[PDB]
């Protein structure tokens, strides 16, 4: 049901992590353990990871231009409430769409986009040189998230508890996105990302020959993405050192429990949740921030037209400002609602195909994440018992149910239910607000 069922996504992610660990052990997980200090950067043959600088990078550009955040978020939109998510610049079919989070679009990966593949591989230490640039991007992106979140929301120095958790989640989303970029699972197709993926395909080609000194990855260049298994194993071997680079900045926050409980101990499991589901949960959080802000504008502009003995005549300025505030509310909620209808339809299509595709049968796929989505939903349906057409006992059968099980929608005010029925008053996309239906009419 959309409207107590246990939340199990995180325990499912733990299962995916164990499977990746054991499968890497059968191959060359041990030969892929890297150390940034053992790499060579800009041909320099000469401590704490939190002291990594711009010199420990193979960005092929001059000083002050080879930073990881170089030229990112020129309009300061990354963490501004109300920024509209836009579709990927996929020009081939456009039948398939996934909305890009503003945090992801302005991610600090510029050093990785402008790598010199010779400097990374010519010395035969591409395993260690790649980790240095990944750790540099992870640390600078985490630092930029903390500062720009406080800037774009004008957060005073005593940060509230809910804003600290929101910042901690954003850093976990960035850690998961970076793992999907390295492994080739990331869904954003763009000019800069195509160039970035091209560098990794050359680097990991040399890596396959670097550790080849039997071959545990025969035919891995035939996989899609190229070197799929070798890149999954490299991530398993070094994912914790990547999160350690992000912990250098998270320790400056005071909250240490809740979603911030990985700041000083442990490694989060977000990188094993399919990216299409992570972005949906992030879409719902930022929709609720926009909705709550627009709702406050409606409470103040229409405050006078609420009581039968108010101060709001049907032609005066208080009624006019209230009707104009209702019009702006309906327009913003409607355009966000159009995005949700495409998101929830794709969710349901993948969920239905998961419980139907047998061992030897398949629907064809086509999407970059089809296999990862079907496998995740199959293991979810196996635990919950929802394996036939007709079972409506699990909330995970709809996107709205997934949000209410795993999402963070406490900031939605009065309009909190992401499903219509089971029409309703507390529906998030209700065009006439039940509390202000009469206020907009004066």
Numbering used by the authors: 733 to 735, 743 to 785, 790 to 956, 964 to 1172, 1181 to 1200
What do the paper's sentences say?
However, the parasite also displays members of variant protein families on the surface of infected erythrocytes, including the multidomain Plasmodium falciparum erythrocyte membrane proteins 1 (PfEMP1). These PfEMP1 cause infected erythrocytes to adhere to the surfaces of blood vessels and tissues, removing them from circulation and protecting the parasite within from spleen-mediated destruction. ICAM-1 binding is mediated by a subset of Duffy binding-like (DBL) domains, the DBLβ domains, which are found in either A-type or BC-type PfEMP1 (26–29). To understand how these BC-type PfEMP1 interact with ICAM-1, we have determined the structure of the DBLβ domain of the B-type IT4var13 PfEMP1 in complex with the N-terminal domains of ICAM-1, revealing divergent, but similar, modes of ICAM-1 binding across the PfEMP1.
The DBLβ domain from IT4var13 formed crystals which diffracted to 2.17 Å resolution. The IT4var13 DBLβ domain adopts the classical DBL domain fold, consisting of an α-helical core decorated by extensive loops. Comparison of the unbound and the ICAM-1D1D2-bound DBLβ domains showed little variation in structure upon ligand binding (root mean square [rms] deviation of 1.07 Å over backbone Cα), with variation predominantly located in loops (residues 805 to 809, 833 to 840, and 1107 to 1117). Secondly, a loop from the DBLβ domain (residues 1107 to 1117) interacts through backbone–backbone hydrogen bonds with ICAM-1D1 to add an antiparallel β-strand to the A′GFC β-sheet of ICAM-1D1. In the unbound DBLβ domain, this loop adopts a different conformation which is stabilized through crystal contacts, indicating that it is flexible and becomes stabilized upon interaction with ICAM-1. This is analogous to a different intrinsically disordered loop that becomes ordered to form part of the ICAM-1 binding site of A-type PfEMP1 (22).
